[PDB]
Amino acid sequence: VDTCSLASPASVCRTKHLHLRCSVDFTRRTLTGTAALTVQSQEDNLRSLVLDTKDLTIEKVVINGQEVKYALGERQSYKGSPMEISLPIALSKNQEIVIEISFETSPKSSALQWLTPEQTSGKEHPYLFSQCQAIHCRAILPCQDTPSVKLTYTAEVSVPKELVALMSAIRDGETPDPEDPSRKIYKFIQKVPIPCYLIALVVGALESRQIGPRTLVWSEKEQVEKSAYEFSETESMLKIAEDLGGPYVWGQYDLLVLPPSFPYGGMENPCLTFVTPTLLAGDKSLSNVIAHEISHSWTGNLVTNKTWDHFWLNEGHTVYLERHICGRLFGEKFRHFNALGGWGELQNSVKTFGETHPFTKLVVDLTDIDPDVAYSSVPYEKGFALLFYLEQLLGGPEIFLGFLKAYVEKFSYKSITTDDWKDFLYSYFKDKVDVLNQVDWNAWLYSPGLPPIKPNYDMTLTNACIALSQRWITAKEDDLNSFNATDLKDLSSHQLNEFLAQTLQRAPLPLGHIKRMQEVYNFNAINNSEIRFRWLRLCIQSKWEDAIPLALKMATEQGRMKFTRPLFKDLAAFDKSHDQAVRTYQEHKASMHPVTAMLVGKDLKV
Numbered sequence: 001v002d003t004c005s006l007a008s009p010a011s012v013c014r015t016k017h018l019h020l021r022c023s024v025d026f027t028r029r030t031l032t033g034t035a036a037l038t039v040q041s042q043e044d045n046l047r048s049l050v051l052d053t054k055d056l057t058i059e060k061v062v063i064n065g066q067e068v069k070y071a072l073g074e075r076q077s078y079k080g081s082p083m084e085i086s087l088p089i090a091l092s093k094n095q096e097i098v099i100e101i102s103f104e105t106s107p108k109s110s111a112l113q114w115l116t117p118e119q120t121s122g123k124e125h126p127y128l129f130s131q132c133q134a135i136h137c138r139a140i141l142p143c144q145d146t147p148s149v150k151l152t153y154t155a156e157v158s159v160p161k162e163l164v165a166l167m168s169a170i171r172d173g174e175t176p177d178p179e180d181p182s183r184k185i186y187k188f189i190q191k192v193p194i195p196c197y198l199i200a201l202v203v204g205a206l207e208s209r210q211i212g213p214r215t216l217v218w219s220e221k222e223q224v225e226k227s228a229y230e231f232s233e234t235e236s237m238l239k240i241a242e243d244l245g246g247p248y249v250w251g252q253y254d255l256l257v258l259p260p261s262f263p264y265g266g267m268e269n270p271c272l273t274f275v276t277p278t279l280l281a282g283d284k285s286l287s288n289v290i291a292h293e294i295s296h297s298w299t300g301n302l303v304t305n306k307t308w309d310h311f312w313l314n315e316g317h318t319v320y321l322e323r324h325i326c327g328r329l330f331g332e333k334f335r336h337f338n339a340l341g342g343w344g345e346l347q348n349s350v351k352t353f354g355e356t357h358p359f360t361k362l363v364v365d366l367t368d369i370d371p372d373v374a375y376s377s378v379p380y381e382k383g384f385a386l387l388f389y390l391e392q393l394l395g396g397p398e399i400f401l402g403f404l405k406a407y408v409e410k411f412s413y414k415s416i417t418t419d420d421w422k423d424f425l426y427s428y429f430k431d432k433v434d435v436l437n438q439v440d441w442n443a444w445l446y447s448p449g450l451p452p453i454k455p456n457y458d459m460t461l462t463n464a465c466i467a468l469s470q471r472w473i474t475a476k477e478d479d480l481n482s483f484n485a486t487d488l489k490d491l492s493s494h495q496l497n498e499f500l501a502q503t504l505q506r507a508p509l510p511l512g513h514i515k516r517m518q519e520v521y522n523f524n525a526i527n528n529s530e531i532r533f534r535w536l537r538l539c540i541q542s543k544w545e546d547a548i549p550l551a552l553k554m555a556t557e558q559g560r561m562k563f564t565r566p567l568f569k570d571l572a573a574f575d576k577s578h579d580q581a582v583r584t585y586q587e588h589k590a591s592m593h594p595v596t597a598m599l600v601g602k603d604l605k606v
């Protein structure tokens with residue numbers, strides 16, 4: 001069972017369907033309406049059940065056309081408050097009923113960011129977006145907020161008529177709102193069973209442009225053209241993903257480019273991937289994020305982690321597929337380059353947390369841990385490393401991709417644990433069980449720190465990055481003159497980024513070295529968010545005061561946590577910028593995404 005949920009477990013009852021009828025009130029920052037849950041008993045004589053909620057106001061609960069008794073328990077910190085509903089008639093096993101709950105969200109809902117007009121591109125209209133993963137769906141509506149339950153859904157959403165609503169679902173029409181002519185009702189259908197963390201909503205002044213046979217890009221009008229170019233490889237990537245994973249079952253694959261405070265690189269919402277506008281580099285160089293979100297259409301959205309302890313199943317396999325997509329497009333040496341970079345990121349995470357820290361285990365125990373606090377690259381990169389190691393052990397990528405496809409087929413529409421995965425691995429590779437038994441499973445799955453074995457990586461594309469980084473680290477003052485813009489002439493953006501990542505692993509460097517780097521390479525002029533991020537961290541860690549305003553700007557003008565959190569941390573650690581970093585956070589806190597505001601405050605000890 002799921003230690004992050006207060007709701008009745010799947011062994012007691014299962015939600016089969018949600019019909020959501022709601023209205024988005026920008027004046028009050030509330031979503032109001034009804035959640036009708038079709039629930040199937042899994043027990044004889046079922047007389048009550050419990051749902052998760054968080055900062056919800058419940059008006060009433062109706063079953064069979066009458067109000068029923070319910071009770072909200074005391075809040076359990078980040079888990080919210082359990083809601084026990086008294087059923088009017090005891091249910092037999094497999095019996096289904098509909099429970100219609102009237103509710104309103106709180107402006108402080110941790111699932112939602114409410115943006116004022118000034119926080120958008122267009123400056124006229126407000127904007128709302130959700131981000132339920134991992135356990136914030138309970139802050140939008142009452143539900144069994146666990147990925148161990150999958151349900152279909154329909155929705156009707158009333159919004160101001162000048163705005164557009166989109167959900168993780170197929171669009172199913174729009175009409176004027178009969179209860180309020182100033183509004184429109186948008187309708188949605190999701191016919192494929194999903195865990196509730198994949199329920200998503202955006203409302204704003206959105207426009208669309210077609211970019212492939214099954215893909216529209218959506219954004220505010222100011223970003224449509226750039227977005228359409230940036231993500232033009234989307235259909236090519238979908239075709240490759242279908243080859244690797246099997247049929248794409250979700251109908252459409254649309255993309256939504258959010259405002260800059262979107263807290264993550266991407267979210268794999270079914271039918272409508274959400275992405276950060278920090279991907280808009282102008283050259284398609286950050287497209288691996290789209291490859292990642294596409295890949296979730298199989299690993300994560302079809303085969304799902306049963307509880308958050310098993311999150312690496314979602315991410316390790318998705319990164320594995322992501323990197324195969326990149327390798328098919330740009331070659332096997334590039335796959336290895338990205339694989340090796342990911343090991344680098346894993347090294348960073350382990351050093352950050354500490355080599356014995358419980359959040360560096362592959363399988364974690366989130367009992368009494370806020371999921372958002374555990375979140376890091378570990379499940380992505382330790383998960384990927386395990387799969388890449390297994391690929392090498394078991395006879396290579398063609399063989400291992402055969403496993404991947406069979407795994408997706410086996411567990412489609414289900415929620416599974418690490419033991420389910422391992423059992424299937426052993427079944428699929430039964431003729432190589434001797435090889436599988438050579439793996440130190442206890443260390444790989446359950447021990448903290450770096451894995452016991454590092455995979456073999458082709459170094460072809462990495463060599464020049466390491467060599468340049470080593471030149472800088474070993475340079476003395478009299479060597480600085482030798483550096484020149486020609487040093488970079490054969491490096492791709494990816495390689496520039498890796499040179500910075502290598503160098504940042506040894507930071508600080510002497511301030512004179514960093515000043516020379518700007519003199520000869522002009523990294524200040526690079527707008528690629530990944531490069532600028534690493535460059536500004538290197539500058540701040542090396543105590544360059546000139547970089548303070550640049551790093552503060554980047555930290556606040558966008559909100560992707562990958563960048564905002566370490567920039568604020570670095571600025572707080574630099575004595576010269578410490579006080580300004582704290583003031584800047586205090587001043588921005590009220591208008592930050594709620595999860596981002598929480599995590600930055602924790603990082604800064606404020």
Ligand SMILES: O=C(c1ccc(OC[C@H]2CCCN2)cc1)c1ccc(-c2ccsc2)cc1
Nearest residue numbers: 133134264311359361362371374375378379
């Ligand atoms: O709860 C989450 C969790 C929290 C947020 C989340 O999603 C947030 C964003 C990420 C991208 C889109 N949604 C997903 C899982 C979680 C679960 C496991 C781990 C972990 C650590 C070492 S091995 C496994 C870390 C975190």
Ligand SMILES: [Yb+3]
Nearest residue numbers: 476477478479
């Ligand atoms: Yb010298």
Ligand SMILES: [Zn+2]
Nearest residue numbers: 292296315318
């Ligand atoms: Zn992912």
